[PDB]
Design an enzyme around this catalytic site. Structure first.
Site, mmCIF file in Angstrom:
data_model
loop_
_atom_site.group_PDB
_atom_site.id
_atom_site.type_symbol
_atom_site.label_atom_id
_atom_site.label_comp_id
_atom_site.label_asym_id
_atom_site.label_seq_id
_atom_site.Cartn_x
_atom_site.Cartn_y
_atom_site.Cartn_z
ATOM 1 N N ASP B 92 0.871 -1.172 0.000
ATOM 2 C CA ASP B 92 0.000 0.000 0.000
ATOM 3 C C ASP B 92 0.917 1.232 0.000
ATOM 4 O O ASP B 92 2.128 1.100 0.151
ATOM 5 C CB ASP B 92 -0.986 -0.003 1.190
ATOM 6 N N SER B 93 0.360 2.423 -0.185
ATOM 7 C CA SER B 93 1.180 3.630 -0.235
ATOM 8 C C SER B 93 1.647 4.139 1.129
ATOM 9 O O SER B 93 2.576 4.943 1.209
ATOM 10 C CB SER B 93 0.422 4.740 -0.952
ATOM 11 N N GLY B 94 0.996 3.677 2.192
ATOM 12 C CA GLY B 94 1.351 4.113 3.531
ATOM 13 C C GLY B 94 0.460 5.246 4.011
ATOM 14 O O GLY B 94 0.307 5.450 5.216
ATOM 15 N N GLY B 95 -0.162 5.943 3.064
ATOM 16 C CA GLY B 95 -1.034 7.061 3.376
ATOM 17 C C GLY B 95 -2.210 6.786 4.291
ATOM 18 O O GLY B 95 -2.424 7.533 5.248
ATOM 19 N N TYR B 96 -2.969 5.729 4.013
ATOM 20 C CA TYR B 96 -4.136 5.377 4.822
ATOM 21 C C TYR B 96 -3.799 5.181 6.294
ATOM 22 O O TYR B 96 -4.528 5.654 7.164
ATOM 23 C CB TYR B 96 -4.806 4.114 4.273
ATOM 24 N N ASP B 146 -2.422 8.263 -2.404
ATOM 25 C CA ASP B 146 -3.642 9.053 -2.482
ATOM 26 C C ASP B 146 -4.042 9.606 -1.126
ATOM 27 O O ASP B 146 -3.274 9.534 -0.164
ATOM 28 C CB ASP B 146 -4.790 8.203 -3.058
ATOM 29 N N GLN B 193 -11.367 7.448 -6.318
ATOM 30 C CA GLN B 193 -11.958 8.072 -5.135
ATOM 31 C C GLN B 193 -13.289 8.684 -5.560
ATOM 32 O O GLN B 193 -13.764 8.424 -6.666
ATOM 33 C CB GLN B 193 -11.023 9.147 -4.555
ATOM 34 N N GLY B 220 -11.637 4.450 -0.820
ATOM 35 C CA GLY B 220 -12.664 5.202 -0.127
ATOM 36 C C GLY B 220 -13.870 4.421 0.340
ATOM 37 O O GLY B 220 -14.909 5.013 0.625
ATOM 38 N N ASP B 270 -7.918 -7.664 0.175
ATOM 39 C CA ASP B 270 -6.932 -7.706 1.238
ATOM 40 C C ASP B 270 -7.668 -7.271 2.487
ATOM 41 O O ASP B 270 -8.548 -6.405 2.425
ATOM 42 C CB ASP B 270 -5.753 -6.755 0.968
ATOM 43 N N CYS B 308 -13.223 -28.031 5.916
ATOM 44 C CA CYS B 308 -11.979 -27.315 5.635
ATOM 45 C C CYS B 308 -10.828 -28.317 5.523
ATOM 46 O O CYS B 308 -10.737 -29.255 6.319
ATOM 47 C CB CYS B 308 -11.688 -26.311 6.756
ATOM 48 N N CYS B 310 -7.427 -27.539 5.678
ATOM 49 C CA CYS B 310 -6.152 -27.035 6.192
ATOM 50 C C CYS B 310 -5.539 -28.012 7.191
ATOM 51 O O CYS B 310 -6.231 -28.871 7.738
ATOM 52 C CB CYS B 310 -6.311 -25.640 6.826
ATOM 53 N N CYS B 313 -7.269 -28.261 10.742
ATOM 54 C CA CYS B 313 -8.485 -29.060 10.828
ATOM 55 C C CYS B 313 -8.228 -30.551 10.661
ATOM 56 O O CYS B 313 -9.081 -31.375 10.982
ATOM 57 C CB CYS B 313 -9.513 -28.579 9.815
ATOM 58 N N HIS B 339 -5.700 -21.531 9.934
ATOM 59 C CA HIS B 339 -7.018 -21.971 9.515
ATOM 60 C C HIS B 339 -7.804 -20.866 8.808
ATOM 61 O O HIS B 339 -8.367 -21.090 7.737
ATOM 62 C CB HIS B 339 -7.835 -22.474 10.702
HETATM 63 N N1 LIG Z 1 -10.477 0.966 2.818
HETATM 64 C C1 LIG Z 1 -9.292 1.445 2.350
HETATM 65 C C2 LIG Z 1 -8.075 0.848 2.727
HETATM 66 C C3 LIG Z 1 -6.839 1.338 2.257
HETATM 67 N N2 LIG Z 1 -5.696 0.717 2.647
HETATM 68 C C4 LIG Z 1 -6.820 2.463 1.383
HETATM 69 C C5 LIG Z 1 -5.528 3.069 0.825
HETATM 70 O O1 LIG Z 1 -4.448 2.579 1.126
HETATM 71 N N3 LIG Z 1 -5.590 4.145 0.010
HETATM 72 N N4 LIG Z 1 -6.857 4.749 -0.363
HETATM 73 C C6 LIG Z 1 -8.033 4.266 0.088
HETATM 74 O O2 LIG Z 1 -9.097 4.780 -0.221
HETATM 75 C C7 LIG Z 1 -8.039 3.070 1.018
HETATM 76 C C8 LIG Z 1 -9.261 2.559 1.498
HETATM 77 ZN ZN LIG Z 2 -9.122 -25.436 8.777
#
Ligand SMILES: Nc1cc(N)c2c(=O)[nH][nH]c(=O)c2c1
Ligand SMILES: [Zn+2]
Ligand SMILES: Nc1cc(N)c2c(=O)[nH][nH]c(=O)c2c1
Ligand SMILES: [Zn+2]
Lengths: 372, 372
Positions: B92-96, B146, B193, B220, B270, B308, B310, B313, B339
């Site tokens: 990720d960019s680190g911004g959030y 962003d 956005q 967003g 993610d 499952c 894994c 389990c 798990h």
């Molecule tokens: N739910 C979200 C999780 C995130 N890691 C981000 C992000 O890293 N940048 N911009 C985003 O809008 C954003 C939304």
């Molecule tokens: Zn399992």
């Protein structure tokens, strides 16, 4: 395999190397047993514990009777099934941790009554109940319930504790034998007491041998007396135990202590040192322990130890583990623990091989020169 | 393999299934990416993460720039080498996380200045510095820097943040392209956005497509608007992005959210849900999540989930994991996490297979009937 069969393949001085055959597996001696506190070897899957070379692990009776419960574990199929370890498991009597971790301990000839350091409940542990709990757990090697004597001890107090322990050893033996299933599938070890006094140790050894046990542990050591004193006591104490049975030194785990103990006739060890090591940053190496948290390891690309063959030293650097520990990451604990237990098992293998090859004394010397 | 190649093998409505080929590996989509916070997927060795079926993991730039440091990780050989994961890594960019975890954030058109929630230090993160840090980490999929808009947002504030994000997207693109090594080996995703406003989302999508990116994330969302609103926004937002490129929904991980998101055109996910699940006792099952800490699981011999596949389990019971979690044991976290991540990967596999077989809609229906 038989219920229990100890055989010595090689010797060098007081040191011995051989095997203990039990229904669940073979134990190579001298042996190091990783400790499973709450039915788990801290931060390690049982398969990983086995991968390090461990043939047997120790189970803490005190913790198990409290947390999940002995009866519950039995209803669930036994400790082996419960935690996923199908090899031998030696269980302590629970007594030592009763005197160390529990509240308001009321002692008597019958046993010990105490309060849980968890829920604040109450339990009446005795030679009979301890043997019973170990049975419920499905233990392979059952330890007799004794009374560990605090250091320093006066000749009179050491004598009284030892005499009580010998009486409790007889009760443990009888309790074990009256339980057919346990007597036929498990083994029973007696525990020698007597503090640092030679005459008491001799009386204890004689009483134990008279009762008869599958193995003999040297109890009452590693309780604040120092290595010199521990070794001095082992010098005269180990020779008093039956030579054809395993000699188990309880609560001893520093690498140098193990080496010196083996030189004095000890075949089995157990300690929290390896698991509690990688919890503060301590990682064992052939050049002595190192504290991974130290800033000098932040960009060290080398593995924990230069010759160690564990998966950790094959895959990760000191720098990464340094970061993990300092970040309070679980993987840091997992990696440090795996390496440390692997280091101990490699130490045991180097000890066994050197004895088998008649060069143990040279190994002990070389080991110390480098380790210190 | 090529630097980046996304190909759709099958479709059903808005749902797609295919693969992304990158130098370090192939990513099957729809894909779920386990999150590696401090250069570690919580309580799991990288081999275990791969064993669950993961083709790619996410790396948090915020944490990494603070704790070990971007420059340090580069000197150590990159994040892949550092943590032992040789497959793709999206960062990720680190911004959030700057706006969520850091202190005294001072924002401007240039970027964001802030204080570390650790040492209390100071950093000036910008589109250029973020791209640079991700490069230093050796990221495979680089996210444009962003400004995430808080929910609820007024049309005017949502417009200003989105417009700034589009300007920052252009700066991210240029920063990425000027770094030859990065442009030739890594991929760059732009982030849409516009909050919940259709016109803004359309303007964002158009600006992003005009610049041109390897993938497009719907940012967003999952910021307090609820599933109904999230789905309503995705309904009109996903169709605005280029159809031939991956659609990534950031910070979305509840099983039902993923299913609904895939039905709306999302290819990548993610979330911390799986890792933070087995930290409070939450274990995912096909019959809905369960809290392993509940007393009803103390003597439950069945595995976490009945079907499952894994390793957890296969080898351990609910009763054992219940005990481990309640005992605060590390193995409890290791087992619960393995798990949960395995459950998510199996969900992604069931989604991919059902799309490939033209029965995804039926899968979504059956999944919900049982899960709720
Ligand atoms: N739910 C979200 C999780 C995130 N890691 C981000 C992000 O890293 N940048 N911009 C985003 O809008 C954003 C939304
Ligand atoms: Zn399992
Ligand atoms: N160091 C020691 C550790 C131990 N777990 C014990 C024990 O369990 N019983 N008796 C003992 O003397 C003893 C000593
Ligand atoms: Zn190692």
């Amino acid at each position: 395999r038989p219920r229990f069969s100890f055989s010595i393949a090689a010797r060098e001085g007081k040191a011995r190397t051989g095997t203990i055959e039990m229904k669940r597996g073979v134990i190579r001696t001298p042996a190091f047993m990783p400790v499973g506190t709450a039915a788990t070897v801290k931060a390690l899957k049982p398969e990983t514990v086995r991968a390090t070379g461990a043939d047997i692990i120790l189970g803490n009776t005190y913790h198990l009777m409290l947390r999940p419960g002995a009866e519950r574990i039995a209803k669930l199929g036994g400790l082996h099934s419960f935690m996923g370890w199908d090899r031998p498991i030696l269980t302590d009597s629970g007594g030592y941790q009763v005197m160390s971790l529990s509240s308001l301990t009321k002692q008597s000839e019958e046993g010990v009554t105490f309060k849980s350091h968890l829920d604040g409940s109450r339990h009446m542990l005795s030679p009979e109940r301890s043997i019973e709990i170990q049975h419920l757990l499905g233990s392979d090697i059952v330890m007799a319930f004794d009374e560990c004597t605090p250091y320093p001890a006066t000749p009179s107090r050491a004598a009284s504790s030892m005499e009580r322990s010998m009486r409790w050893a007889k009760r443990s033996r009888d309790a074990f034998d009256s339980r057919k299933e346990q007597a036929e599938n498990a083994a029973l070890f007696g525990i020698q007491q007597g503090s640092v006094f030679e005459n008491l140790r001799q009386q204890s050894a004689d009483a134990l041998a008279e009762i008869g046990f599958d193995g003999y542990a040297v109890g009452g050591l590693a309780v604040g007396e120092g290595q010199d004193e521990m070794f001095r006591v082992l010098d005269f104490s180990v020779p008093m135990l039956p030579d054809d049975k395993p000699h188990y030194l309880m609560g001893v785990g520093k690498p140098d202590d193990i080496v010196g103990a083996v030189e004095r006739g000890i075949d089995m060890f157990d300690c929290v040192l390896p698991t509690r090591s990688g919890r503060n940053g301590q990682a064992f190496t052939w050049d002595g322990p190192i504290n991974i948290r130290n800033a000098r390891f932040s960009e060290d690309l080398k593995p924990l130890d230069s010759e160690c063959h564990c998966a950790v030293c094959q895959k990760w650097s000191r720098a990464y583990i340094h970061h993990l520990i300092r970040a309070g990451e679980i993987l840091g604990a997992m990696l440090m623990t795996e390496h440390n237990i692997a280091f101990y098992q490699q130490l045991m293998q180097k000890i066994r091989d050197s004895i088998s090859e008649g060069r143990f004394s040279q190994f002990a010397q070389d080991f110390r020169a480098r380790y210190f």
